[PDB]
Design a protein around this ligand. Structure first.
Ligand SMILES: CC(=O)SCCNC(=O)CCNC(=O)[C@H](O)C(C)(C)COP(=O)(O)OP(=O)(O)OC[C@H]1O[C@@H](n2cnc3c(N)ncnc32)[C@H](O)[C@@H]1OP(=O)(O)O
Ligand SMILES: CC(=O)SCCNC(=O)CCNC(=O)[C@H](O)C(C)(C)COP(=O)(O)OP(=O)(O)OC[C@H]1O[C@@H](n2cnc3c(N)ncnc32)[C@H](O)[C@@H]1OP(=O)(O)O
Ligand SMILES: [Cl-]
Ligand SMILES: [Cl-]
Ligand SMILES: [Cl-]
Ligand SMILES: [Cl-]
Ligand SMILES: [Mg+2]
Ligand SMILES: [Mg+2]
Lengths: 180, 180
């Protein structure tokens, strides 16, 4: 149909965290305090020391106000052939190489306007290019909140069945089909 | 010093496996039969179905003779703070997101001429670009042969201490310093 995907503008850009920053992290506020302290206290130093890869959503003005962010880090999970509630009970399992979407926060002022989805689309595309280079099978996410959990589910993230009941996965095969 | 690294020529190129192939896999012969059967029987179909990422060393002639190859696949290993010969004995450990160099074979005619190292350098560079995108901490390799084991060690791959005594690792921090 006359069906389009709309990404980041030049007014509000998504870019990987820079070497020299000049970002206004002091004004950012999403719902959760945890994701707020992380941004101002840990994000820049964890990115520098390559503990994670930080991508920022910012105003592209001289002040450079941060209005959202996300993090990516190589991960792995065991994929059982059937739901195995008791770990390693002769049920087949492969180790699935994935990328974990560790954090995802959007400023309250921007929430519910499609920016969370646009950042997810950005992450999916970063994972997709990397998959074709080194072999990554998807985007993993452990959703704390119920509001966060329904958000990932909506976008087509498969809720995984396991001992922990908050994990979701978006396969690379599915990302392939998004970008054709 | 007047110290240089010399890579693939236009006569002998390293490239990711193509969609349409036209490679002469029938003439390839390294020392090991296993790595020979893999190339002609499994390589092309495992790459297509994205089970791994295959990179080929070929003659760049019309016949397109394959004279070496390698495979990359996202992996993970548990990194203990101290050598832990008995798994999970209250000794600290992080899960290390890595890329596994699954296979590496060079045709007998080309062996001992720097092509194994050049392919390793290629893989390190592919892993390096991917690290900066998604967060990968190094290149993992499980060396079967003693000749294969000494080869990886020579290039600066840290032999890992564990239950399995044939694994080696080349950190991303070290790759950073190679390409500056
Ligand atoms: C850190 C983790 O891994 S878990 C993340 C938890 N983080 C938080 O909860 C922090 C506070 N919350 C936030 O930061 C944000 O609200 C997020 C990250 C949860 C979501 O980002 P937002 O931009 O607010 O959501 P977005 O506007 O993209 O989507 C709103 C909803 O409309 C729907 N929607 C989105 N885009 C469209 C569209 N183009 N057309 C129709 N429907 C749409 C989606 O389904 C989405 O989820 P819902 O249907 O369950 O409501
Ligand atoms: C599949 C796995 O993960 S394990 C791989 C096992 N595969 C096999 O054994 C298959 C058969 N063997 C082969 O395919 C090849 O012999 C390989 C893959 C083992 C090595 O590739 P080659 O191109 O033959 O080795 P290369 O010529 O790069 O290096 C030769 C040696 O000279 C040294 N060397 C390499 N380049 C240089 C250089 N520029 N200057 C000085 N010394 C060098 C290296 O240390 C290397 O190892 P060694 O020192 O232990 O001998
Ligand atoms: Cl399987
Ligand atoms: Cl779930
Ligand atoms: Cl730690
Ligand atoms: Cl070892
Ligand atoms: Mg929004
Ligand atoms: Mg050689």
């Amino acid at each position: 149909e006359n069906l389009y995907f709309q990404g980041a503008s030049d007014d509000l850009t998504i870019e990987i965290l820079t070497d020299d920053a000049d970002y206004d992290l002091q004004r950012f506020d999403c719902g959760e305090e945890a994701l707020n302290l992380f941004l101002t206290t840990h994000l820049v130093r964890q990115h520098r020391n390559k503990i994670l890869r930080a991508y920022i959503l910012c105003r592209n003005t001289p002040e450079r106000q941060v209005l959202g962010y996300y993090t990516l880090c190589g991960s792995c999970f065991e994929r059982a052939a059937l739901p195995s509630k008791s770990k390693q009970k002769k049920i087949p399992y492969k180790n699935i190489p994935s990328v974990t979407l560790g954090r995802l926060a959007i400023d309250r002022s921007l929430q519910g306007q499609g920016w969370g989805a646009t950042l997810v689309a950005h992450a999916m595309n970063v994972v997709w290019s990397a998959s074709l280079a080194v072999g990554i099978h998807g985007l993993f996410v452990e959703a704390l909140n119920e509001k966060a959990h329904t958000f990932f589910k909506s976008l087509g993230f498969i809720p995984l069945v396991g001992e922990n009941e908050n994990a979701l996965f978006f396969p690379t095969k599915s990302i392939e089909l998004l970008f054709t």
